[PDB]
């Protein structure tokens, strides 16, 4: 997250870190949201690679023991069947991960609340992106969980020629685009939390940014719109 601030450690308890085994170690690769005790939602493009993955919940500092982490293997990966890896702009950038064990809930580990199907945010709605992603274009991962305030940009504006044009689809949410704050590599898969009727909900799964860089004016971060996939998600979970 570029232009973010450190999150409080009990602010975003559904945020997870998706890690892959990198020699003797594990490395953060993207974010996600805990949606059941044994299921995680992330971006499809985060699990394109044939790697060994684990989820970490209750994580705040990637490089320090917080005393709150639970580490769980990924047992099954269900990518959206219409996902096409060389076509992120087509959409369907969403995947569900079944965890080897169910995690235990506490003030650091909670289920993400999903919006109701079909819900669309008004232009300029207050939202936060969270993650451990790069803190500058071509920079390095954050140590501690970051948050940035990224007001939504509605489809009409986002899909205009000076923004994203036809690349953005109705099944996406855009947010930010001020040139200062944005998503960045390593934030993919993580949540966009938007305050609606007094309650944060996860409206977006971080999907892409410009190739011109993370924080670029009129290129708001693009998220998979979670409210477009509620049926898909429930169907997956029910059939597994």
Annotated binding site for Ca(2+): 59, 61, 64, 69
- Binding segment for Na ion (CB under 5 A), chosen from 59-67, 127-135, 181-189, 202-210, is 59-67
Can you tell me which of 10, 66, 119, 217 binds Na ion, judged by CB under 5 A? 66
Among candidate residues 188, 207, 210, 227, the one labeled active-site is 188
Does residue 87 have an active-site annotation? no
Burial, 107: exposed, middle or buried (Cβ in 10 Å; 0-12, 13-18, 19+)?
exposed
Does residue 182 have an active-site annotation? no
Closest CA to 160 of 221, 93, 219: 219
**Is residue 61 near Na ion by the rule CB under 5 A?**
yes
- Binding segment for Na ion (CB under 5 A), chosen from 22-30, 64-72, 192-200, 214-222, is 64-72
- Let me know: does 213 contact 184? Beta carbons within 8 Å: no
Kindly state the smallest distance separating residue 59's Cβ from Na ion, in Å.
5
Buried b / exposed e along 9-36 (16+ C-beta atoms within 10 A)? bebbbbbbbbbbeeeeebebbbbbbbbb
Buried b / exposed e along 62-77 (16+ C-beta atoms within 10 A)? beeeeebbbebebeee
**Is residue 119 near Na ion by the rule CB under 5 A?**
no
Q: Which residues are annotated as a binding site?
A: 59, 61, 64, 69
Does residue 45 have an active-site annotation? yes
Site residues (vs Na ion, CB under 5 A): 61, 66
Q: Which residues are catalytic?
A: 45, 93, 188
């Amino acid at each position: 997250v570029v232009g973010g601030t450190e999150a409080q450690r009990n602010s975003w308890p559904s945020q997870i870190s998706l890690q892959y085994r990198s020699g003797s170690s594990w490395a953060h690769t993207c974010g996600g949201t805990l949606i059941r005790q044994n299921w995680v939602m992330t971006a499809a493009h985060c699990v394109d690679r044939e790697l060994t993955f684990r989820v970490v919940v209750g994580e705040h500092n990637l490089n320090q023991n917080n005393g709150t982490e639970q580490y769980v293997g990924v047992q099954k990966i269900v990518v959206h069947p219409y996902w096409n890896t060389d076509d992120v702009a087509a959409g369907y950038d969403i995947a569900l991960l079944r965890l080897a064990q169910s995690v235990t809930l506490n003030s650091y580990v909670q289920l993400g609340v999903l919006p109701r199907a079909g819900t669309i945010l008004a232009n300029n709605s207050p939202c936060y992106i969270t993650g451990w992603g790069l803190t500058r274009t071509n920079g390095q991962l954050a140590q501690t969980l970051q948050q940035a305030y990224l007001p939504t940009v509605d489809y009409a504006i986002c899909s205009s020629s000076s923004y994203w044009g036809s690349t953005v689809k109705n099944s996406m949410v855009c947010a930010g685009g001020d040139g200062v704050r944005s998503g960045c590599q390593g934030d993919s898969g993580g949540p966009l939390h938007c305050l609606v009727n007094g309650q944060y909900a996860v409206h977006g799964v971080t999907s892409f940014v410009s190739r011109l860089g993370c924080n670029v004016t009129r290129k708001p971060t693009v998220f998979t719109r979670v409210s477009a996939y509620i049926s898909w998600i429930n169907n997956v979970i029910a059939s597994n």
